[PDB]
Amino acid sequence: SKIDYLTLFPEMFDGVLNHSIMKRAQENNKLQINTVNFRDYAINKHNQVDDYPYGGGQGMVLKPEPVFNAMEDLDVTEQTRVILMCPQGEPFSHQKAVELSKADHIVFICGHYEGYDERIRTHLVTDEISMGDYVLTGGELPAMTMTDAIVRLIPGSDGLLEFPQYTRPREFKGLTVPDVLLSGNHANIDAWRHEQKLIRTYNKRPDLIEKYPLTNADKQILERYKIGLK
Ligand SMILES: N=C(N)NCCn1cc(-c2c[nH]c3nc[nH]c(=O)c23)nn1
């Protein structure tokens, strides 16, 4: 499997591909990653990859020819998935990460451009994906985050919040690890962790409690808690 990124700043990805999961999986002969710069396929008078929009508008638009050429050199096939980092795209999701981990070749089109030529979108892009309602400067960090979640799904819940976890030391600033965790009584350790899960969910995410098949023990735990409050 292989991932290629079209970027103006191929060096933003320095140290994110040479370390962690990217370093591991790429070393392991699992994924080939290539960075590709624009303006390496530009032919404009200033070697530009953006020009002004027909009809007017404030911004500048990425031109189609450098991008189709970039797809050409990257040996994009009819089954390659070309992902446009688009602020109005479908929000990225675990479902989509599972879907994309099934893909032999992937290309991210990254860029700060206010606009993209519609030719690119109609005949080149297979996928347009957002990071969320917030506004970013470019598609490079989105591209890398999505790559993280996808690569992690390469061969290389219960409905509640997590239970608190503690490690050494037992005491720190007078803040004491709960004693049940050191008693070596695993039935109590698990019962306590479950109680904390119910209580933390009740306090911070009551919607999750509503969608949870509460037992009679769970109801009693929450009721003893909310009475212990008063
Ligand atoms: N087309 C416009 N407005 N570009 C402006 C500059 N920009 C933004 C993005 C972008 C990519 N992915 C995102 N996910 C969530 N919000 C975002 O803003 C983005 N890429 N370039």
Curated annotation (Swiss-Prot):
Organism domain of life: Bacteria
CDD domains, sorted: TrmD-like
Oligomer status and interactors: Homodimer.
Positions contributing to S-adenosyl-L-methionine binding: 111, 131-136
E.C. number: 2.1.1.228
HAMAP family: TrmD
Protein name: tRNA (guanine-N(1)-)-methyltransferase
UniProt-annotated location(s): Cytoplasm
Family note: Belongs to the RNA methyltransferase TrmD family.
Role description: Specifically methylates guanosine-37 in various tRNAs.
Any one GO cellular component localisation term in the record: cytosol
UniProt keyword list: Cytoplasm, Methyltransferase, S-adenosyl-L-methionine, Transferase, tRNA processing
Catalytic activity from the UniProt record: guanosine(37) in tRNA + S-adenosyl-L-methionine = N(1)-methylguanosine(37) in tRNA + S-adenosyl-L-homocysteine + H(+)
UniProt GO MF annotations: tRNA (guanine(37)-N1)-methyltransferase activity
SUPFAM superfamilies to which the protein is assigned, alphabetical: alpha/beta knot
Entries under Pfam families matching the protein: tRNA_m1G_MT
NCBIfam families the UniProt entry points to: PRK00026.1 (NF000648), trmD (TIGR00088)
Listed GO biological process terms: tRNA N1-guanine methylation
Organism: Staphylococcus aureus (strain MSSA476)
Keyword Cytoplasm: yes
